[PDB]
RNA sequence: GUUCGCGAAGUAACCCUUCGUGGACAUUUGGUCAAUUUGAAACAAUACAGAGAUGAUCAGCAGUUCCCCUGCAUAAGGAUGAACCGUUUUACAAAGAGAUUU
């Protein structure tokens, strides 16, 4: 059963380290983007452009 | 300033001496640039993380780029120097059938 689980995991992978890091980096860049807009919106609502 | 010529004063008169006066000689430097904050050097420092093809550890050599750095360099080195990894819709037609409408 563990052999099958490990086989399914290794059979799934298709991208190397650089592409995988680019995926996580794009997700982090998006979360940073939304945090930036949240702070900017709070400031704007307070009349601070 | 010098020198050539002329007026004059001084001297008995020259030499010489002074005041005046004409000519000759010599003739336009330098800045793309002002002297600390506001016309632009960078490293470093603090933190986190710890290198592609892999199950794992790695040698690499390239290509593309409106990224270059070190080097005298057309050599070599810089993680295979780095970035590369995402997003993807129409030259759109033909034949036929069963339902919709006057
Ligand atoms: K490492
Ligand atoms: K390598
Ligand atoms: K190399």
Short mmCIF file of C-alpha atoms (C1' of nucleotides) and ligand atoms in Angstrom, two decimals:
data_model
loop_
_atom_site.label_atom_id
_atom_site.label_comp_id
_atom_site.label_asym_id
_atom_site.label_seq_id
_atom_site.Cartn_x
_atom_site.Cartn_y
_atom_site.Cartn_z
CA UNK A 1 0.00 0.00 0.00
CA UNK A 2 2.89 2.35 0.79
CA UNK A 3 4.62 1.25 -2.41
CA UNK A 4 1.52 2.26 -4.41
CA UNK A 5 1.28 5.61 -2.62
CA UNK A 6 4.92 6.43 -3.37
CA UNK A 7 4.48 5.30 -6.97
CA UNK A 8 1.46 7.58 -7.48
CA UNK A 9 3.41 10.48 -5.98
CA UNK A 10 6.46 10.04 -8.19
CA UNK A 11 4.34 9.36 -11.27
CA UNK A 12 2.53 12.67 -10.71
CA UNK A 13 5.52 15.03 -10.81
CA UNK A 14 6.35 16.73 -14.13
CA UNK A 15 8.21 19.98 -13.32
CA UNK A 16 11.67 20.63 -11.92
CA UNK A 17 12.79 22.76 -9.01
CA UNK A 18 12.84 26.07 -10.91
CA UNK A 19 9.29 25.79 -12.29
CA UNK A 20 7.96 24.70 -8.88
CA UNK A 21 9.62 27.64 -7.17
CA UNK A 22 8.17 29.94 -9.82
CA UNK A 23 4.72 28.60 -8.92
CA UNK A 24 5.13 29.32 -5.21
CA UNK A 25 6.74 32.69 -6.00
CA UNK A 26 3.81 33.76 -8.18
CA UNK A 27 1.41 32.84 -5.38
CA UNK A 28 3.45 34.85 -2.87
CA UNK A 29 3.65 37.81 -5.27
CA UNK A 30 -0.14 37.76 -5.56
CA UNK A 31 -0.64 37.70 -1.78
CA UNK A 32 1.78 40.61 -1.43
CA UNK A 33 -0.17 42.45 -4.13
CA UNK A 34 -3.44 42.01 -2.25
CA UNK A 35 -1.89 43.09 1.06
CA UNK A 36 -0.57 46.22 -0.66
CA UNK A 37 -4.01 47.06 -2.05
CA UNK A 38 -5.65 46.39 1.34
CA UNK A 39 -3.38 48.88 3.10
CA UNK A 40 -3.83 51.40 0.28
CA UNK A 41 -7.62 51.04 0.49
CA UNK A 42 -7.66 51.56 4.26
CA UNK A 43 -5.58 54.70 3.81
CA UNK A 44 -7.84 55.92 0.98
CA UNK A 45 -10.99 55.40 3.06
CA UNK A 46 -9.36 57.52 5.79
CA UNK A 47 -8.86 60.33 3.25
CA UNK A 48 -5.10 59.65 2.97
CA UNK A 49 -4.41 59.27 -0.76
"C1'" G B 1 60.08 100.25 -22.16
"C1'" U B 2 63.75 100.48 -26.07
"C1'" U B 3 65.17 102.96 -30.48
"C1'" C B 4 65.18 106.47 -34.91
"C1'" G B 5 63.90 111.76 -36.07
"C1'" C B 6 62.47 116.66 -34.58
"C1'" G B 7 61.55 121.39 -30.65
"C1'" A B 8 63.46 123.17 -26.23
"C1'" A B 9 66.28 124.15 -21.59
"C1'" G B 10 71.25 123.56 -19.27
"C1'" U B 11 76.86 124.34 -21.48
"C1'" A B 12 81.38 129.33 -24.61
"C1'" A B 13 80.33 125.14 -28.14
"C1'" C B 14 80.26 119.64 -28.74
"C1'" C B 15 79.66 115.22 -25.78
"C1'" C B 16 76.13 114.69 -22.20
"C1'" U B 17 71.30 115.98 -19.39
"C1'" U B 18 66.14 116.81 -18.83
"C1'" C B 19 60.96 118.45 -20.49
"C1'" G B 20 57.94 118.13 -24.98
"C1'" U B 21 56.70 115.74 -29.70
"C1'" G B 22 56.26 112.37 -34.32
"C1'" G B 23 57.51 107.40 -36.30
"C1'" A B 24 59.27 102.15 -35.45
"C1'" C B 25 59.20 97.70 -32.38
"C1'" A B 26 55.37 94.32 -29.23
"C1'" U B 27 48.85 93.06 -30.32
"C1'" U B 28 43.19 89.71 -27.77
"C1'" U B 29 44.67 84.41 -22.72
"C1'" G B 30 40.95 80.91 -20.82
"C1'" G B 31 36.10 77.74 -19.91
"C1'" U B 32 31.98 71.27 -22.91
"C1'" C B 33 34.31 72.43 -16.48
"C1'" A B 34 31.80 77.56 -10.11
"C1'" A B 35 33.36 75.68 -4.01
"C1'" U B 36 29.42 70.25 0.72
"C1'" U B 37 23.06 68.64 0.95
"C1'" U B 38 18.71 69.13 -4.49
"C1'" G B 39 20.93 65.90 -11.38
"C1'" A B 40 22.46 61.14 -9.29
"C1'" A B 41 28.91 55.34 -8.21
"C1'" A B 42 28.54 51.20 -5.52
"C1'" C B 43 29.49 47.79 -1.73
"C1'" A B 44 27.97 46.73 2.97
"C1'" A B 45 24.69 46.06 7.09
"C1'" U B 46 19.76 43.22 9.54
"C1'" A B 47 16.70 39.36 8.46
"C1'" C B 48 15.11 34.95 5.83
"C1'" A B 49 16.43 31.33 2.48
"C1'" G B 50 20.44 27.82 0.71
"C1'" A B 51 22.02 26.00 -6.73
"C1'" G B 52 18.96 23.04 -13.33
"C1'" A B 53 17.96 18.31 -15.86
"C1'" U B 54 16.51 14.15 -9.52
"C1'" G B 55 13.81 9.25 -5.87
"C1'" A B 56 19.17 11.44 -4.54
"C1'" U B 57 24.05 14.12 -5.46
"C1'" C B 58 26.29 16.43 -9.31
"C1'" A B 59 30.07 17.78 -14.34
"C1'" G B 60 28.56 20.44 -18.03
"C1'" C B 61 28.19 23.12 -23.27
"C1'" A B 62 24.81 26.11 -25.66
"C1'" G B 63 20.59 29.03 -27.62
"C1'" U B 64 17.05 33.41 -27.07
"C1'" U B 65 17.13 38.46 -24.17
"C1'" C B 66 15.77 46.37 -25.13
"C1'" C B 67 20.24 41.90 -17.85
"C1'" C B 68 24.92 42.01 -17.70
"C1'" C B 69 29.57 41.58 -14.22
"C1'" U B 70 35.23 40.21 -13.90
"C1'" G B 71 38.99 40.13 -17.45
"C1'" C B 72 44.05 42.93 -22.15
"C1'" A B 73 40.78 39.67 -24.60
"C1'" U B 74 37.59 37.16 -30.47
"C1'" A B 75 40.41 33.28 -24.05
"C1'" A B 76 38.39 31.97 -19.66
"C1'" G B 77 35.39 32.84 -15.34
"C1'" G B 78 30.84 34.68 -13.01
"C1'" A B 79 25.15 28.65 -9.66
"C1'" U B 80 25.15 24.96 -16.65
"C1'" G B 81 26.26 33.87 -14.66
"C1'" A B 82 21.16 35.32 -14.50
"C1'" A B 83 16.12 35.54 -16.77
"C1'" C B 84 13.55 31.09 -19.56
"C1'" C B 85 8.87 27.43 -16.27
"C1'" G B 86 3.27 31.85 -17.19
"C1'" U B 87 -0.93 32.65 -20.34
"C1'" U B 88 -3.25 30.16 -24.40
"C1'" U B 89 -10.37 30.21 -28.94
"C1'" U B 90 -12.19 32.59 -35.06
"C1'" A B 91 -8.18 32.38 -42.66
"C1'" C B 92 -13.83 28.07 -39.37
"C1'" A B 93 -16.18 25.66 -43.51
"C1'" A B 94 -19.01 21.34 -45.94
"C1'" A B 95 -22.73 17.45 -46.08
"C1'" G B 96 -27.13 15.58 -43.52
"C1'" A B 97 -31.08 14.67 -39.92
"C1'" G B 98 -34.79 15.68 -36.13
"C1'" A B 99 -37.04 19.18 -33.78
"C1'" U B 100 -38.49 25.24 -33.57
"C1'" U B 101 -41.16 29.90 -37.00
"C1'" U B 102 -44.64 32.70 -41.44
K1 LIG C 1 22.72 23.51 -1.18
K1 LIG C 2 26.34 23.09 -12.89
K1 LIG C 3 30.21 28.04 -17.21
#
